[PDB]
Each structure stands twice: as structure tokens, then as C-alpha cells.
Nucleic acid binder design. Structure first.
Ligand SMILES: Nc1ncnc2c1ncn2[C@@H]1O[C@H](CSCC[C@H](N)C(=O)O)[C@@H](O)[C@H]1O
Length: 353
DNA sequence: TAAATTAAGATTAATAAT
DNA sequence: ATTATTAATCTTAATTTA
């Protein structure tokens, strides 16, 4: 049978909502050590998560929309072998509604824009030409109490489609990098510096984790590892998993990071020093060049990995991709099988066979 | 020439309507 | 329950700025 997405998309449960599940039955092969945590977009071409689950020991994905953790939706699938009881959220949780998340916006927000929630944060931002087109469409009705319905429809659907917020008179503009940073749960200016351009900031932020969602899942690790963990971070990006562990106060004795973007590696190392991490950070570039024996050598030096965490590329899965939405075997999304290859090396030492 | 700008539909699912 | 309509969606690439 095909994988049906859960409605509501709350996974095994989210804060302040009914339907929390405290126990599941995992397949014997799925079982740690190591713990592992895999992330990707939920809204793939047909059959993709079935294949991902087949290669991750038939674990059913946990589908969670991050709108239950912040102001912006983020419908993601999570395959992991973590315990699911006694999760807790990092504090304080981010603002839940647009009204609280954008305090100045009530000055410009139209009554007929009924959004209390933003849509997914993506790598492609709305253009200044779109802002002008919306402004021009609304101005012939400035002294009218309300524009006609067909004009309202165009503006509303463009604000949703491009995740625009009202910032000036008849002015709907996309989110700023620091706003994306805060909604995704990163500290302010996390992706400012390290040679990252504003353009690259948009892409890296759009590709990243929602930290509060991932932290809520990883929270179960805190009683398990009082002395911290050795982490294998695959497709690290701007370090969503590391920020989550940091916010959970779970010591990272070691992070071996694999991330091909140089500016992303700079952002992660900047975070490592600015938060005064006492553990060691090791940075690799291309996962395709990371050999099995290197993983085994690292485990022999540092004593294995307690957690393997990563999200492999989505560009060949994402609905926004006009060119190469060819599925799991696309040039970038096929790097999922590199995640499985590395994970299997860790499992061979940790659990055997 | 790094950085910025802009527009380029299709695929599903969720929801509404028989 | 079945069908039709609405709705969301970790993007690529060509091009221009500066
Ligand atoms: N061959 C490769 N080796 C290593 N990393 C790669 C790669 N190809 C792509 N990547 C990286 O895979 C990442 C996928 S996006 C994942 C982002 C991460 N979860 C975060 O919190 O930010 C990107 O950062 C991309 O640069």
C-alpha cells in the first residue's frame, strides 16, 4: 500500500495538540546503536518515501508540519529510530501567529488577508516586480474602503504563493534573511558572516531544518547521554541539527560534519567558536569522497557515533523545481543512498553483522 | 565575476462538490 | 464514496548589476 500522509500532519504528536503517541514498535533491524535521524520534504513525487523507508529498514516516516512549532509551515518527513516518549520542546518556543511574529505588520495588514500562518520557507524569494504589481493593483482603490473581490483574490494568492508580508502601504514583501533565521529557530545573524552572501543566505536558510521541530524530536537523547554524544552530521548545511543539540544542552563531544558548500562550512565553524563548544568539529566536503574506511578510522579514534543525522537534497523532489523534479534518482537527491552507505558503516561497528 | 534579479509549470494532496 | 476544484511547494537557470 502507498504511504498516506497523516492529516493533521502531527507525526507522533506535537505540543498543545491532541493525538500524542508515546510508544511505537520498531523493526528489529531499525534498532540502534547508532541512533539516526533522516529528514526530507514530505511532498515528493509518488513512491519516493516508500523507497526511502525501504532503505532505512522499513521504518515508517514521521510526517510533521512545523506550523505546529512556528509561524511558517514546513511539511517534512522524518525517519529515525529514536524513542518517542518524554519529548520536550526547547524554550521559549517561537511566535506562533503572524500577529505575534510580525508585530509591526498590523499597521499594514488588510482585513481581507486572513492569514495567521505563513507557508513554507523556500530558497526562492519573491521579486520586487511582484511587490510593484501588487501595489499597482491596489492603488486605484486607496480611498475605497476595500478593493473588489477579483483584485483581492489576485493579491491574496500572490501573497500565499510567494510568502509575502505587509510592510508598507499596499506593499507586500518577502521575508528577510534574519526573519527566516528566527522562524527556522536559528540565533540572529547565524548565517551572517563566513563569506555568505545575502543571495546564498536565502538558499542555505531555505534548505535548512526548522530547529524547534528537530530539537523536539532529539530531546529524548538528553537522559540517554548525560556525558554528551559523538555526532556524524551528513549534509550539515548551516548546522540545524547542531543548533538543536546546542539548544537542548546536549554536549557535542565530537561532530564529524559532511557538507560540500564552503560558506556553509564557514557558518558551522563560526557557530562552533561563537558558542564556545569544547568538543571537536571535523569538517569534510563531498560525501561521495568520504570512504568507508575513513568512517571506520574515525570511529576507532573517537569511539563510534551515538547519532547519525542529516537531510539529503530535495531539489529533485521539490514541487518548486521546474527543471529536474525527476525523483530520488536525480543527480542531487540520489545522494540519499550515500547517507545509507555511511549509516551502514556505522551500524556495522556499533551493532554488528 | 560575485552577487543580485527575475520569471520559468507540474505534481500531488487537501478540500470541496457532486 | 467519487469526482472536481483548490492549494501548497527545502527550485533552476538565464540574465543583468555593480
Ligand atoms: N556531495 C555532497 N556532499 C556533501 N554535502 C552535499 C553534497 N551535495 C549537497 N550537499 C549538501 O547537502 C545539503 C542538503 S540541505 C540540508 C541542510 C541541513 N539540514 C541544515 O540544517 O541546514 C546542502 O547543504 C548541500 O550543500
Amino acid at each position: 500500500e502507498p504511504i498516506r500522509l497523516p492529516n493533521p500532519m502531527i507525526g507522533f504528536g506535537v505540543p498543545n495538540e491532541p493525538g500524542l503517541i508515546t510508544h511505537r514498535s520498531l523493526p528489529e533491524l531499525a534498532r540502534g546503536p547508532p541512533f539516526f535521524y533522516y529528514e526530507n520534504v514530505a511532498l515528493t513525487p509518488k513512491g519516493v518515501w516508500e523507497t526511502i523507508s525501504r532503505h532505512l529498514f522499513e521504518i515508517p516516516p514521521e510526517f510533521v508540519d512545523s506550523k505546529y512549532f512556528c509561524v511558517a509551515a514546513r511539511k517534512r518527513g522524518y525517519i529515525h529510530n529514536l524513542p518517542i516518549n518524554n519529548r520536550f520542546q526547547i524554550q521559549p518556543p517561537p511566535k506562533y501567529t503572524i500577529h505575534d511574529a510580525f508585530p509591526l505588520s498590523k499597521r499594514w495588514w488588510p482585513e481581507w488577508d486572513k492569514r495567521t500562518k505563513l507557508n513554507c520557507i523556500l530558497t526562492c524569494t519573491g521579486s520586487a516586480q511582484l511587490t510593484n504589481r501588487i501595489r499597482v493593483a491596489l492603488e486605484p482603490y486607496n480611498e475605497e474602503p476595500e478593493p473588489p473581490k477579483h483584485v483581492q483574490r489576485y493579491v491574496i494568492d500572490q501573497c500565499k504563493k510567494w510568502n509575502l508580508v505587509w510592510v508598507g502601504k499596499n506593499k507586500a514583501a518577502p521575508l528577510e534573511p534574519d526573519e527566516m533565521e528566527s522562524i527556522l529557530g536559528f540565533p540572529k545573524n547565524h548565517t551572517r558572516g563566513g563569506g555568505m552572501s545575502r543571495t546564498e543566505r536565502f538558499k542555505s536558510l531555505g534548505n535548512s531544518f526548522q530547529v524547534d521541530t528537530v530539537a523536539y524530536h532529539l530531546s529524548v537523547l538528553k537522559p540517554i547521554f548525560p556525558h554528551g554524544i559523538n555526532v556524524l552530521s551528513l549534509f550539515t548545511g548551516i548546522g540545524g541539527g547542531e543548533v538543536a543539540l546546542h539548544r537542548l544542552q546536549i554536549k557535542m563531544k565530537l561532530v564529524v560534519s559532511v557538507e560540500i558548500s564552503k560558506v556553509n562550512r564557514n557558518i558551522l565553524k563560526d557557530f562552533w567558536e561563537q558558542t564556545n563548544q569544547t568538543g571537536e568539529l571535523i569538517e569534510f566536503s563531498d560525501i561521495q569522497h568520504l570512504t568507508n574506511d575513513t568512517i571506520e578510522g574515525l570511529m576507532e579514534k573517537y569511539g563510534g557515533f551515538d547519532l547519525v543525522i542529516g537531510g539529503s537534497p530535495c531539489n529533485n523532489l521539490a514541487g518548486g523545481n521546474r527543471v529536474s523534479r525527476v525523483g530520488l534518482e536525480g543527480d542531487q537527491s540520489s545522494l540519499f543512498f550515500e547517507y545509507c552507505r555511511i549509516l551502514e558503516v556505522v551500524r556495522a561497528r556499533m551493532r554488528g553483522s
